[PDB]
Amino acid sequence: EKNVSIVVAASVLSSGIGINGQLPWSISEDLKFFSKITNNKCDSNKKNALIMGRKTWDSIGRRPLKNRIIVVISSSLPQDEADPNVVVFRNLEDSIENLMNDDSIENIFVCGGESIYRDALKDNFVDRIYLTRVALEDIEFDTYFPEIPETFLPVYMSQTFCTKNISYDFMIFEKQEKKLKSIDDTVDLLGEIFGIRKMGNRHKFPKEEIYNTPSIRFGREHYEFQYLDLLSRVLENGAYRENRTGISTYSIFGQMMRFDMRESFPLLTTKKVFIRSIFEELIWFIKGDTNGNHLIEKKVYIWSGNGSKEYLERIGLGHREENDLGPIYGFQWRHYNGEYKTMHDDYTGVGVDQLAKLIETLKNNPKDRRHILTAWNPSALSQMALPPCHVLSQYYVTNDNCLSCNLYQRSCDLGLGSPFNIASYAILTMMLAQVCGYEPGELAIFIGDAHIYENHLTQLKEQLSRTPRPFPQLKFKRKVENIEDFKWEDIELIGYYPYPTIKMDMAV
Amino acid sequence: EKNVSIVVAASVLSSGIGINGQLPWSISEDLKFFSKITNNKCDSNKKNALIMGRKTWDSIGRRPLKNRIIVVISSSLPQDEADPNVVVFRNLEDSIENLMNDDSIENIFVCGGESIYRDALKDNFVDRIYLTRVALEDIEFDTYFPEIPETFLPVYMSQTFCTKNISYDFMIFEKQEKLKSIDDTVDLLGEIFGIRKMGNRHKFPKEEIYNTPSIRFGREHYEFQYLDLLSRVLENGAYRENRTGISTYSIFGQMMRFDMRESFPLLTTKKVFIRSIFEELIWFIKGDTNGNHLIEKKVYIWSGNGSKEYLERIGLGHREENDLGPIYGFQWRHYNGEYKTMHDDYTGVGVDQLAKLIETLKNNPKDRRHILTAWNPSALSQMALPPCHVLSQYYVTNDNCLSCNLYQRSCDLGLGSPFNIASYAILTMMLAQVCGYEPGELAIFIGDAHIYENHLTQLKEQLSRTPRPFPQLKFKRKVENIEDFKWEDIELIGYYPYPTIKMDMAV
Numbered sequence A: 001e002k003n004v005s006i007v008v009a010a011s012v013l014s015s016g017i018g019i020n021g022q023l024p025w026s027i028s029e030d031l032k033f034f035s036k037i038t039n040n041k042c043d044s045n046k047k048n049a050l051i052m053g054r055k056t057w058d059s060i061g062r063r064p065l066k067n068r069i070i071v072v073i074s075s076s077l078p079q080d081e082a083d084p085n086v087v088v089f090r091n092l093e094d095s096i097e098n099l100m101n102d103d104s105i106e107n108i109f110v111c112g113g114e115s116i117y118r119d120a121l122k123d124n125f126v127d128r129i130y131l132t133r134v135a136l137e138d139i140e141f142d143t144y145f146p147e148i149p150e151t152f153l154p155v156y157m158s159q160t161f162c163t164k165n166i167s168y169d170f171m172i173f174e175k176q177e178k179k180l181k182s183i184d185d186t187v188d189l190l191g192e193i194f195g196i197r198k199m200g201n202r203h204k205f206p207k208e209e210i211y212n213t214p215s216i217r218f219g220r221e222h223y224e225f226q227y228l229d230l231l232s233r234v235l236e237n238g239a240y241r242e243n244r245t246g247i248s249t250y251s252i253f254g255q256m257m258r259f260d261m262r263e264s265f266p267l268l269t270t271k272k273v274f275i276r277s278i279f280e281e282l283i284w285f286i287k288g289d290t291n292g293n294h295l296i297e298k299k300v301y302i303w304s305g306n307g308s309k310e311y312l313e314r315i316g317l318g319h320r321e322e323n324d325l326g327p328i329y330g331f332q333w334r335h336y337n338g339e340y341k342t343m344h345d346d347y348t349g350v351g352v353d354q355l356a357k358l359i360e361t362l363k364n365n366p367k368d369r370r371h372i373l374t375a376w377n378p379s380a381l382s383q384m385a386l387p388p389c390h391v392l393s394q395y396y397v398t399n400d401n402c403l404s405c406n407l408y409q410r411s412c413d414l415g416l417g418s419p420f421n422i423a424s425y426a427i428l429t430m431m432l433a434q435v436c437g438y439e440p441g442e443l444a445i446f447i448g449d450a451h452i453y454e455n456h457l458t459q460l461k462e463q464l465s466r467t468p469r470p471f472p473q474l475k476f477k478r479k480v481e482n483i484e485d486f487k488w489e490d491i492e493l494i495g496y497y498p499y500p501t502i503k504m505d506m507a508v
Numbered sequence B: 001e002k003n004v005s006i007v008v009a010a011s012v013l014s015s016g017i018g019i020n021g022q023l024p025w026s027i028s029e030d031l032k033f034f035s036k037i038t039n040n041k042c043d044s045n046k047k048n049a050l051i052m053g054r055k056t057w058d059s060i061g062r063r064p065l066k067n068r069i070i071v072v073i074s075s076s077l078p079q080d081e082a083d084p085n086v087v088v089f090r091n092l093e094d095s096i097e098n099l100m101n102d103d104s105i106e107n108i109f110v111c112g113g114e115s116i117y118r119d120a121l122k123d124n125f126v127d128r129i130y131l132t133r134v135a136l137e138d139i140e141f142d143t144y145f146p147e148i149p150e151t152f153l154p155v156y157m158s159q160t161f162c163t164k165n166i167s168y169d170f171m172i173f174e175k176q177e178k179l180k181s182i183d184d185t186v187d188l189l190g191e192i193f194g195i196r197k198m199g200n201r202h203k204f205p206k207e208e209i210y211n212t213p214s215i216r217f218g219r220e221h222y223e224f225q226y227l228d229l230l231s232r233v234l235e236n237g238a239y240r241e242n243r244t245g246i247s248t249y250s251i252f253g254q255m256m257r258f259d260m261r262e263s264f265p266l267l268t269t270k271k272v273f274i275r276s277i278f279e280e281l282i283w284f285i286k287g288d289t290n291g292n293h294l295i296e297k298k299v300y301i302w303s304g305n306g307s308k309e310y311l312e313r314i315g316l317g318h319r320e321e322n323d324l325g326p327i328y329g330f331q332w333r334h335y336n337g338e339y340k341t342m343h344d345d346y347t348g349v350g351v352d353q354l355a356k357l358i359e360t361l362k363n364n365p366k367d368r369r370h371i372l373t374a375w376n377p378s379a380l381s382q383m384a385l386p387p388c389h390v391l392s393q394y395y396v397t398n399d400n401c402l403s404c405n406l407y408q409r410s411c412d413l414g415l416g417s418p419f420n421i422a423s424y425a426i427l428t429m430m431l432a433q434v435c436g437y438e439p440g441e442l443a444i445f446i447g448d449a450h451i452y453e454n455h456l457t458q459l460k461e462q463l464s465r466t467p468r469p470f471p472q473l474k475f476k477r478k479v480e481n482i483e484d485f486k487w488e489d490i491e492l493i494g495y496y497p498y499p500t501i502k503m504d505m506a507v
């Protein structure tokens, strides 16, 4: 018995695989992939067979593929042995029987053509599916990959990769089929005896009804799962608790998330994330601005709630003007320890400029272990509309000249805050990198109180039902000399195809 | 063919399993284990059989064990027919013969006796060994569990558990003999992208540097949290120079978890000197920055960075020897206080975070703002050394335990890390006592996790020893103020470490 699996690359949304007899894109790595997986075998004396429609044969240029034996499906072509490494069959049904014969053939691959895919599937001929998702969407297709039958389940999803600014993705699907205990049993019993006295019971693995893409058990490589799985983890273990807002949450303490920034930009796809607001709040921080009006003026309202007259009055800052947030994130970054008056005052030269120092240090002493930025000032906490949630960040230059960032975040609203925080510190690191002459590295976020407000429960359940797509790419149109110079127009987001936005009320 | 497992509870160091015909300790949970493990079966119509020597039959009361069939090995006991759930045999070989029928009998267990354990092993009878390590030594034993054969390799090690202040854990040993689908794809994809695929930047450690390699899916003992971060840098650590003369191997952004409910995370694979740790902690707590006061008590961990040759080198030779400046203690009690010298009276100067902390944990426990920090941009220049364990957060569970999170920007795995873990396990226990809570969990998030090149051979020495159960740490009395804690107030129970490992600090 031998294996027969499909290999294909289609657009992420509509699954387009071709146009005018050609691929709709040019990605080396993907072909290098097709080659690697297609030649993969363990019997030297044997070879793999690659079935393909005639038109695809025309696209390949009718030349053989090294170490393999192409197999064309055509109504009209000769069965001669001009080339031993190429055979032809009148139909796909018959094309199978490489099993029946050819102990010289180890594995079979359907390299397709739409018609051929749609039949290999229709007749239950295929076992596995190697699918390369390409974030190239808005563009003419004449050939598409058939909708995957529900008898298949994804078991692997790779991280996102980049080529010519195009994001993409390797997935594997498999068909469903019928029907050492010692450790699991011992641990279970030990769990019955000790209850929550055994830490493991305090960190129970998420039940599948709340596990994203459950079928992917050992292949959760997409680093978007770092966020989706945290969501699951708290949905499963989160203790119910009251808080200052009056809207209770489910909270666990001390989690982590890593994201790569070398090959892509971590902007969540399982829901539409509004990146106009993340960047805008970012330079707003970078410039050391604490006037919430400047934000509202650019139609960004994320700080209105904690800026209103009532709330300010409620927390004892009734003297402030309608949106004077006090010495929050911006102020601490540019003027740590500055004596704060109002948002109208000029703070030029007052306080310690950490961002400026960070940059001068990253350039001059890169391997220095003190690249730190903090917003936690005990002396100023009472003047802040809100004490800083993402509390301090550390920056780290690799030997191969990338800039990575670590951020501890005391309080994290998984539904509303986190997506923003991820995109933000990714952008900040990139900006920092360009300005210091580096490439983006990795992003790691350490969370203290990781929670999900109880009025976000059905919305997050919704998001958890959507399988993640490839992360988009983010590029700067120009190299600026001063970090405080970036503008929205300077930003280019390439290949972002999120699921629909999901409304979620913030708790003031 | 049927499974044969041993079940035993022996002391961690000398393998003592008995004294004067009875167990040398009383641990309820362990018996519950024995009961659950030996009762565990698939077929309801079948039963398991427990083999034991006559003396064990004696100590067991000579009454049957519910739901199971006892098999007594005795040369003398009368082979009657009376109790259906108990049988006697004249030798081990013959009892096997459980294996050949009683298909009623699903699984087999050797519940031992020094003589029976020794024989089940000597004759290649056992497939598995369930071993409860009890952290009790320095007490008489007249019976022992034999030495584990080399044909056996550990596959599981539970976290440390606590009963009547006694530390203990659970292990499993297997015997040796002679879907790549996803893994193949990842390999190939790795070939194609190299360092571009994040996974290649985080390679799994080679087993030559992995502690106790046999335990693949069962490294539950959270000594592994540290030991594994160690081998993880050993595998990916980028060689790089540093302020000091000694280069380092490092990776960025790591984390470790530790349970503090059933045990105290004091590393066992190497003797850790907790006393210096304690003395440094109250020193911090007091808000003291005087390196002398530390040297006073024979604690020199800070002399290195307190020497005039060092203070001179960093442009601080302007002050007395060992006047470290506004460092940990000063920022904790007197954050943003204007530092002068280690002698002035700072009463009232600066924000008292430690005080606020205790007041908040008590008055508002669910509050998401229990933070303690040491990173003060304005003071960094006056410090003999900038803070390394930089800021922590504290957390009150609904079940009244206190958890702590720590972020170290810089972390010397061989020397500092072991100290930081213990230090904060203590600080959290203190806070919890003072605030009326129980110890919770400890998580350490690291920035620059590194290993100084002059520690390589020592750390590989450490990675060669299999971890032992964590000990327990108890306070002898309840204190009024958190700064009333004294060394004698601390009680370290059940700490049996491997020999200490000498490592030099990079000044």
Ligand SMILES: NC(=O)C1=CN([C@@H]2O[C@H](COP(=O)(O)OP(=O)(O)OC[C@H]3O[C@@H](n4cnc5c(N)ncnc54)[C@H](OP(=O)(O)O)[C@@H]3O)[C@@H](O)[C@H]2O)C=CC1
Residues within 6 Å of the ligand: A007, A008, A009, A010, A017, A018, A019, A020, A021, A022, A023, A052, A053, A054, A055, A056, A057, A059, A073, A074, A075, A076, A077, A089, A090, A091, A092, A111, A112, A113, A114, A115, A116, A117, A143
């Ligand atoms: N992105 C990706 O992963 C891939 C994309 N592609 C793209 O797909 C396109 C080709 O798709 P498609 O148009 O389907 O062409 P195909 O490669 O599927 O070729 C179809 C041809 O195969 C023969 N054939 C098909 N069905 C039968 C049958 N039932 N019995 C006998 N012969 C049969 C016929 O040729 P005849 O008339 O000679 O009998 C038919 O014209 C190209 O644009 C190519 O670039 C191709 C492979 C992979």
Ligand SMILES: NC(=O)C1=CN([C@@H]2O[C@H](COP(=O)(O)OP(=O)(O)OC[C@H]3O[C@@H](n4cnc5c(N)ncnc54)[C@H](OP(=O)(O)O)[C@@H]3O)[C@@H](O)[C@H]2O)C=CC1
Residues within 6 Å of the ligand: B007, B008, B009, B010, B016, B017, B018, B019, B020, B021, B022, B023, B052, B053, B054, B055, B056, B057, B059, B073, B074, B075, B076, B077, B090, B091, B092, B111, B112, B113, B114, B115, B116, B143
């Ligand atoms: N920690 C733990 O998990 C356990 C500890 N223990 C401890 O171990 C001690 C008992 O061990 P031990 O002293 O070895 O006594 P055992 O329980 O091993 O029994 C020894 C007796 O078994 C019979 N016997 C043993 N070997 C043979 C043989 N080869 N042929 C015929 N008969 C044999 C003999 O009985 P006879 O004289 O009738 O022929 C012998 O006197 C107790 O102190 C108990 O507390 C026991 C079980 C578990």
Ligand SMILES: C#CCN(Cc1ccc2[nH]c(N)nc(=O)c2c1)c1ccc(C(=O)N[C@@H](CCC(=O)O)C(=O)O)cc1
Residues within 6 Å of the ligand: A245, A274, A277, A302, A303, A306, A413, A415, A416, A417, A418, A420, A421, A502, A503, A504, A505, A506, A507, A508
């Ligand atoms: C972190 C952070 C920054 N912040 C600051 C901020 C301030 C107070 C907070 N308070 C609470 N309880 N949770 C938060 O996430 C939070 C976040 C945010 C504030 C609001 C939204 C928000 O409601 N976002 C909507 C976007 C609406 C839109 O952009 O049009 C969303 O659907 O995501 C996001 C981030």
Ligand SMILES: C#CCN(Cc1ccc2[nH]c(N)nc(=O)c2c1)c1ccc(C(=O)N[C@H](CCC(=O)O)C(=O)O)cc1
Residues within 6 Å of the ligand: B273, B276, B301, B302, B305, B412, B414, B415, B416, B417, B419, B420, B501, B502, B503, B504, B505, B506, B507
């Ligand atoms: C973290 C921290 C606290 N500190 C403070 C401290 C200060 C500067 C440092 N510098 C460097 N490079 N590494 C450190 O771990 C370090 C630690 C420590 C200092 C010394 C030892 C140490 O040498 N411990 C013993 C040796 C001394 C003894 O015998 O007691 C050991 O061999 O383990 C441990 C912790």
Ligand SMILES: Nc1nc(=O)c2c([nH]1)NCC(CNc1ccc(C(=O)N[C@@H](CCC(=O)O)C(=O)O)cc1)=N2
Residues within 6 Å of the ligand: A007, A008, A009, A023, A030, A031, A032, A034, A035, A036, A038, A056, A059, A060, A065, A066, A110, A111, A112, A130, A131, A132
């Ligand atoms: N995943 C996937 N991607 C594809 O582009 C693809 C596919 N599958 N299946 C069939 C197909 C049809 N088109 C093509 C085009 C070129 C080659 C090809 O050049 N194969 C050589 C490439 C050598 C290389 O790039 O290293 C091979 O050696 O496999 C194969 C199929 N293309």
Ligand SMILES: Nc1nc(=O)c2c([nH]1)NCC(CNc1ccc(C(=O)N[C@@H](CCC(=O)O)C(=O)O)cc1)=N2
Residues within 6 Å of the ligand: B007, B008, B009, B023, B030, B031, B032, B034, B035, B056, B059, B060, B065, B066, B111, B112, B131, B132
């Ligand atoms: N791991 C281990 N610990 C032991 O103490 C132990 C062992 N294994 N193997 C054999 C043995 C011999 N002594 C004893 C003493 C009492 C019981 C006993 O009464 N067992 C009951 C306990 C029920 C309970 O405590 O919940 C049983 O139901 O099995 C068994 C063996 N003792």
Ligand SMILES: O=c1ccn([C@H]2C[C@H](O)[C@@H](COP(=O)(O)O)O2)c(=O)[nH]1
Residues within 6 Å of the ligand: A243, A244, A386, A387, A389, A390, A410, A411, A412, A413, A414, A416, A417, A418, A421, B368, B369
């Ligand atoms: O950058 C931010 C701003 C704050 N929040 C969330 C954390 C909490 O849900 C709330 C802050 O409330 P406190 O933890 O301070 O009570 O807003 C974030 O997640 N990230």
Ligand SMILES: O=c1ccn([C@H]2C[C@H](O)[C@@H](COP(=O)(O)O)O2)c(=O)[nH]1
Residues within 6 Å of the ligand: A369, A370, B242, B243, B385, B386, B388, B389, B410, B411, B412, B413, B415, B416, B417, B420
């Ligand atoms: O609590 C501590 C005290 C400092 N060190 C180590 C970290 C480095 O090995 C060295 C300080 O190096 P810098 O990052 O400050 O250059 O001391 C620790 O690991 N933990």
